[PDB]
């Protein structure tokens, strides 16, 4: 599809068998998810921006379905108010910027 920027580019995603809202974010290197449980081990990480840094847990090889497209890769889980789909998964689903 083609997603407008008049509003935040929020789309529905599915992870596990859970459906959520997430932001398609070209400014984010990584995908950041709101606090949730995932199985397996993780690595500690710190990620920052305007304002500073939050502590997150890095899981690898996580499936996120985005508008029917299955992306598999690293996700960072922590105290974000919004699920953020970053370039590591946007590339997989063939997402481009166009103007």
Ligand X SMILES: CC(C)CN(C[C@H]1CNC[C@@H]1COCc1ccccc1)S(=O)(=O)c1ccccc1
- Residue numbers at the binding site for its own copies (CB under 8 A): 1-6, 8-9, 23-29, 32, 47-54, 67, 69, 78-81, 84, 87, 90-91, 93-99
Name the residue with the smallest CB distance to ligand X: 49
Binding partner of 91, given its own copies, ligand X, none, CB within 5-8 angstroms per partner class: its own copies
Task: Using alpha carbons, list the distances in angstroms from residue 63 to 11, 16, 58, 70, 86.
Answer: 16, 7, 14, 7, 14
Active site residue 30: no
Q: Which does 44 bind (CB under 5 to 8 A by kind): ligand X, its own copies, none?
A: none
64 touches 31 (CB < 8 A): yes
């Amino acid at each position: 599809p083609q997603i407008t920027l008049w509003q935040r580019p929020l789309v529905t995603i599915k992870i596990g068998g859970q459906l959520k809202e997430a932001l398609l974010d070209t400014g984010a290197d990584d995908t950041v998810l709101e606090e949730m449980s995932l199985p397996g081990r993780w690595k500690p990480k710190m990620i920052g921006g305007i304002g500073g840094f939050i502590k997150v847990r890095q899981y690898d090889q996580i499936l996120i379905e985005i508008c029917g497209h299955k992306a598999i890769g690293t996700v960072l889980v922590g105290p974000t108010p919004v699920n953020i789909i970053g370039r590591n998964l946007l590339t997989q689903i063939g997402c481009t910027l166009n103007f």
